[PDB]
Structure formats: C-alpha cells, structure tokens
Design a protein around this ligand. Sequence first.
Ligand SMILES: *[C@@H]1O[C@H](CO)[C@@H](O)[C@H](O)[C@H]1NC(C)=O
Lengths: 44, 49
Amino acid sequence: YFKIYSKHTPVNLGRDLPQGFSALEPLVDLPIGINITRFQTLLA
Amino acid sequence: QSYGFRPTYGVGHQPYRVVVLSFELLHAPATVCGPKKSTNLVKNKCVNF
Ligand SMILES: *[C@@H]1O[C@H](CO)[C@@H](O)[C@H](O)[C@H]1NC(C)=O
C-alpha cells in the first residue's frame, strides 16, 4: 500500500521555506508488495 | 506428430476447444474479485444498511 500525498501551494512568494499551515490530500493507495529502502529523483 | 483432424467421424478424435482457469490465494490485498449485488434505497424508516 504505497501511499503518496500531494499538495500544490503557489501562494508563497518564497525565499527559503514558507511559515504557514497546510494539509496533504491522498491520491492513491496502490500496493507493491516489496519494501523500499533507497530512492532517487529523476531530473530532465 | 500432427493431429490429423477430420469432420466426418464421431467423438473422441473431434476438436474439443478447451479453456482453463487457475486461481491462488496468497497474502496479498484483494485485487481481482467478483461482483457484489446492489439493492434499492429507501428513506424515513428504521431499516438495515
Ligand atoms: C526488506 O528489504 C531488505 C533489503 O533492504 C530485504 O532483505 C528484506 O527481505 C525485506 N523485507 C521483506 C519482508 O521482504
């Protein structure tokens, strides 16, 4: 049950990190059946 | 060796089309399952749901 959560807040002007309250909504609870210990980000 | 089919003779050597089904119950979340029946909807009565 690989859970991901996404939140898209563009209302920050942004210098390092905003100071405010926000929530995260569920997107999918799809299962993989194997544990994960490492990950990497794909960049174009 | 080829089968050597024929339409002019009776059973035994006739073409019998066969399809099989295979199932298993492993410790996994339920993904492939059958239908569940849906009933009507009623209001303003102390009923079950
Ligand atoms: C979790 O991952 C490790 C490797 O990082 C693996 O050896 C182990 O078998 C995994 N756990 C299960 C329950 O498969």
